[PDB]
Design a protein around this ligand. Structure first.
Ligand SMILES: CCCN(CCC)C(=O)c1cc(C)cc(C(=O)N[C@@H](Cc2cc(F)cc(F)c2)[C@H](O)[C@H]2CN(S(=O)(=O)c3ccccc3)CCN2)c1
Ligand SMILES: CCCN(CCC)C(=O)c1cc(C)cc(C(=O)N[C@@H](Cc2cc(F)cc(F)c2)[C@H](O)[C@H]2CN(S(=O)(=O)c3ccccc3)CCN2)c1
Lengths: 390, 389
């Protein structure tokens, strides 16, 4: 590990998002910011809200600059509207630099902030193409790289605990690491395999094959990326295109058929519980996603365990049972490799070389019989045809 | 002799299938159903789908009965997942009867429904042996015959237009006729010749000889029926076993050599166009399929024209050119006499006498020089050897 100052600088969990501490303004105002590779706007609460115990106060910052322009950003989930401006920003547990970046001061929001999440803003790490209102609003990471000598690359190690974390616990627990400008070798085991970033807007990738316990889902690979596949820390679940979701669920059900679970479970709505320590991990299948490699006709795969796709939750009776929710759901906007998937790996967003790396995470949850994996190479043809075109 | 209430009750085209109107439930829910002699399950969309503008709503039918069982049916083309049940079914332009039949309520599907086809379900008319999940699930036609006095027989007259039919046109045009329980003499000319239904699962038949412009393809006749030969309205093209397909294409290319076409054409993937009205039908050969007759050592033949095996399609430029696709393709599951072949004839599915009849269709496309034909008899020996085991 060569970036000890940034190791363990994240907190949170898959269900409420992982955040990093930042400061904005002069004097610096400390705020917790959700790490989101699924959007491109840096925005912070700038007015009172029931779920916020603090927010950005522009009138108290001598370096605040008003851009005299409003902005409205609706996400799948919720939305917010705010006022654009710029100010000096820093990351206490990050590179030792300060940069002037665009900041959307959130004045109104609907279903955006999460009660008890402990974060007050969002850091969109994706590209300018999807920044609102348009690509002229330079994203934070672009500002960071342009104004400093920090390498154009960041890596994320999201650490799920493997069990429920109450309010106090989630506040004291280390949730992972965000290495700004590099790769810390202590955060993973095995080798790093890279898949190309198909296009620079979302961190889009191309999945070329899918297996459930080694069994090929056998769908036209184009289906896996319809209408796109992205790596998104700003989303809890692994979301899959309708048809892929239906096929996957059918296969996962078949593999775990020794136990019958209610429809609400597979819909990702209701939890299932087992007596403390008896979760039958072994009856659930591993899931392998093959991704396009950097070399022609070459692919590699990442394999996740049920310890990744079954999200730990507290029982409604807060009993001593171990409960979870099925963390895979359908999408109508392409595949979304959310936080529960990222929790099994150390993910390297290599913007400089337009590629994303994957390696088994040193903090992924597993059992004595199975482990997550990143293996290769495999001979795969016509992978370009797996990519979708509107 | 004539069934005016059923004449012209079909709509559609070879490329998207021919369908008949049906009603399910109480009160009646009208749906357009694909006529398919190549499968044995009656199934209808029962949940929203981008290609459907209507579907079966079980909660609105007082006569709906839940069988509490799912059913999964994968076809060559696509597939659907459904829930089994029964309900009262009728055919507005068919026999004046109501039947309680098995219905698979399609809840999920992959490449099954066709955008713009106008049908929302499928009517598998083949036998129980190939019904899913197993042969205990009585096919619609079996229920029909068992619950009513309708004769155990139906006949199909699929009418290809000979040219492309746009969206509005195909919706207003008469696609043909499905006569349930009888034979309408106005739908064909000449005599009806019958070939035996080898076995009751698919409507399986035995081809004993193949000719391209009179020239014998000269293959072991067992190759023509490997691993089976069926009459399937649920498939567009004439599909032939790999080895037969390769020999047939070579012969058809040789016969039409005065003009060269790209490989994509012979692969049935790309169209070929000619200035309006100039399609060189005459350079293309007729295709004759000899079928086993009902009399020992006797056979008859049905002759198809390029007007049948070249499927009319609209040019990408919507120009005034007359374009087509080669409607003959390779198969790995035996010969499939699809819609384009059926369009040249009136086909009688005589279940009661376990045989299929063919007669020149009153609506087949042709030109002033050639016509489709059904002629016989011919002396053919060891025809049983042509069947695959
Ligand atoms: C239920 C509470 C939220 N959580 C748990 C905590 C993480 C989810 O699991 C969850 C679930 C669903 C169905 C959607 C989202 C979502 O929208 N995430 C966005 C970030 C986010 C996090 C949050 F905490 C609350 C929010 F309001 C939003 C992410 O940037 C998407 C957004 N889109 S875009 O097309 O809208 C889009 C928006 C803006 C620009 C470009 C595209 C693309 C993929 N990247 C999040
Ligand atoms: C490209 C769109 C479809 N069209 C144009 C519209 C007609 C085709 O030209 C076409 C092309 C090919 C290569 C196959 C089929 C096909 O599977 N047809 C089945 C009906 C069908 C129609 C449709 F509209 C969409 C579909 F999903 C399916 C038919 O029941 C077969 C099925 N099999 S079985 O072995 O699977 C089989 C299935 C079930 C039980 C037993 C065997 C045997 C021969 N009878 C259709």
């Amino acid at each position: 590990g060569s970036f000890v100052e940034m190791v363990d600088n994240l907190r949170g969990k898959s269900g409420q998002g992982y955040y990093v501490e930042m400061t904005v303004g002069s004097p610096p105002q400390t705020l917790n910011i959700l790490v989101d590779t699924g959007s491109s706007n840096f925005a912070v609460g700038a007015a009172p809200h029931p779920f916020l115990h603090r927010y950005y106060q522009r009138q108290l910052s001598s370096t605040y600059r008003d851009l005299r322009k409003g902005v409205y950003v609706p996400y799948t989930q919720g939305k917010w509207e705010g006022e654009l401006g710029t100010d000096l920003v820093s990351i206490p547990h990050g590179p030792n630099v300060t940069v002037r970046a665009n900041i959307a001061a959130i004045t109104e929001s609907d279903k955006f902030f999460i009660n008890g999440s402990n974060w007050e803003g969002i850091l969109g790490l994706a590209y300018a193409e999807i920044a609102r209102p348009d690509d002229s609003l330079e994203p934070f990471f672009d500002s960071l790289v342009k104004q400093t000598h920090v390498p154009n690359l960041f890596s994320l190690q999201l650490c799920g605990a493997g069990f429920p974390l109450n309010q106090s616990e989630v506040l004291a627990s280390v949730g992972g690491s965000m290495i700004i400008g590099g790769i810390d070798h202590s955060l993973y085991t095995g080798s790093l395999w890279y898949t190309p970033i198909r296009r620079e807007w979302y961190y889009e990738v191309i999945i070329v094959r899918v297996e459930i316990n080694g069994q090929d889902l056998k769908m036209d690979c184009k289906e896996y990326n319809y209408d796109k596949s992205i790596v998104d820390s700003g989303t809890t679940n692994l979301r899959l295109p309708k048809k892929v979701f239906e096929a996957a669920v059918k296969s996962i059900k078949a593999a775990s058929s020794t136990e019958k679970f209610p429809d609400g479970f597979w819909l990702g709505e209701q939890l299932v519980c087992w007596q403390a320590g008896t979760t039958p991990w072994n009856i659930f299948p591993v899931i392998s996603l093959y991704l396009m490699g950097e070399v022609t006709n070459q692919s590699f795969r990442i394999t996740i365990l049920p310890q990744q796709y079954l999200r730990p939750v507290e029982d409604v009776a807060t009993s001593q049972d171990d409960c979870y929710k099925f963390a895979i759901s359908q999408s109508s906007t392409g595949t979304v490799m959310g936080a529960v998937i990222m929790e099994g790996f150390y993910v390297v967003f290599d913007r400089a070389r337009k590629r994303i790396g994957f390696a088994v995470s040193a903090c992924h949850v597993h059992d004595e019989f199975r482990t997550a994996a990143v293996e290769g190479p495999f001979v795969t043809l016509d992978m370009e045809d797996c990519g979708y075109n509107i």
